[PDB]
């Protein structure tokens, strides 16, 4: 191979840039739009392009709210990630005082490591992504509508317009792929823009629960 392996490290990085841009992290358009040949210039074959430390990204910063708010995208070399890899990742995050990270695992994650991400801290939140999910940006898939994470001042209008409580809205799971993509948590509302058969649009709403 080596042609195929670099292709993944370009598409995954491109999708990770697209996810960060959608989540509101600040990624330059040059990072967002890249070509495999341009990627080859930074690194070419599987030896020179190393998944563990070469592609790690702490560049993303939440420009909208906090310049300090930062996200680390970590790709572990080992196919299944143990707590030991997670503990090394946590220590790097603890020193920098960064509170969010993405871990991009290649085949999976061992069960005792998965349990750690629930309870390591509420103030140190890490999201597992399999790389096989990142080879295709689901927000550009033809069956997935536009999702828009609503502000609290807009949720307060939704519930006022219909005279609802929150627990009467339709639900969306946190384990939902598009919920993971935007990184939303319980009690956020997503606006969903479904396309009509005509030129028009229908607007619907869901609650994360």
């Amino acid at each position: 191979d080596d042609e195929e392996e670099t292709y993944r490290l370009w598409k995954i990085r491109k999708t990770i840039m697209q996810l960060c841009h959608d989540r509101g992290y600040l990624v330059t358009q040059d990072e967002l739009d890249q070509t495999l040949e341009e990627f080859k210039a930074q690194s070419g074959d599987k030896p020179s392009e190393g998944r563990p430390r070469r592609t790690d990204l702490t560049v993303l910063v939440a420009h909208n709210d906090d310049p300090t708010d930062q996200m680390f995208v970590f790709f572990p070399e080992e196919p299944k990630v143990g707590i030991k890899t997670i503990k090394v990742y946590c220590q790097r995050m603890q020193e920098e005082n960064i509170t969010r990270a993405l871990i991009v695992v290649q085949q999976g994650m061992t069960p005792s490591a998965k349990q750690s991400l629930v309870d390591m801290a509420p103030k140190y939140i890490l999201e597992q992504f399999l790389q096989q999910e990142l080879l295709i940006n689901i927000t550009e898939h033809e069956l997935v509508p536009e999702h828009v994470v609503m502000t609290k001042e807009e949720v307060t209008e939704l519930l006022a317009r219909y005279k609802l409580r929150e627990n009467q809205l339709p639900r969306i799971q946190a384990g939902d792929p598009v919920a993971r993509y935007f990184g939303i948590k319980r009690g956020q509302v997503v606006k969903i823009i479904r396309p009509s058969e005509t030129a028009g649009r229908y607007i619907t709403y869901r609650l994360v629960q």
Binding site: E140, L143, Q173, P177, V178
Partner: protein, 159 residues
């Protein structure tokens, strides 16, 4: 005639892998298993397959149908978080009242289990208002009726 194009139809279930193999354009790959789609592409794409794969199999057999019926059946089936198929099991995750579940299958377990919990059900729907002889809130019952007869909140007498 103008363009001859090849699309490979795969019989199988791993949509995530078959939408990543180099050369398969994931953006337009689709499936006929709502469970596979729901796991890989959110709930809202799982709503659109339940619309599509019913409206695909209904026009295949002749049998025209409005989409507004399927737009309701899909939207009921996926409105509580996950796709809740209409079986005996999906009714438990859809309804709160006991007698509507108890008039359906598993009448023994659904009545004892709701006695184990102290289940206060209100009497609503139609599967309970028909059982308890109370007029249903659906249809004619939604609106109450008033008499325009000569009346007024009158003044009292001086005491």
């Amino acid at each position: 005639s103008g363009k001859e194009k090849y699309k490979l139809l795969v019989e199988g279930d791993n949509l995530r892998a078959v939408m990543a193999t180099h050369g398969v354009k994931g953006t337009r790959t689709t499936s006929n298993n709502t469970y596979e789609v729901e796991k890989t592409l959110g709930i809202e794409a799982a709503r659109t397959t339940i619309i599509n794969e019913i409206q695909y199999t209904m026009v295949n057999h002749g049998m025209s149908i409005d989409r507004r019926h399927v737009m309701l059946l899909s939207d009921l089936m996926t409105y509580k978080g996950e796709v809740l198929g209409i079986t005996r099991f999906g009714l438990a995750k859809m309804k709160e009242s006991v007698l509507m579940l108890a008039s359906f299958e598993k009448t023994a377990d659904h009545l004892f289990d709701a006695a184990y919990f102290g289940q206060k059900d209100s009497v609503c729907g139609v599967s309970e208002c028909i059982i308890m002889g109370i007029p249903m809130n659906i249809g004619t019952g939604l609106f109450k009726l008033l008499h325009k007869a000569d009346r007024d909140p009158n003044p009292p007498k001086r005491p």
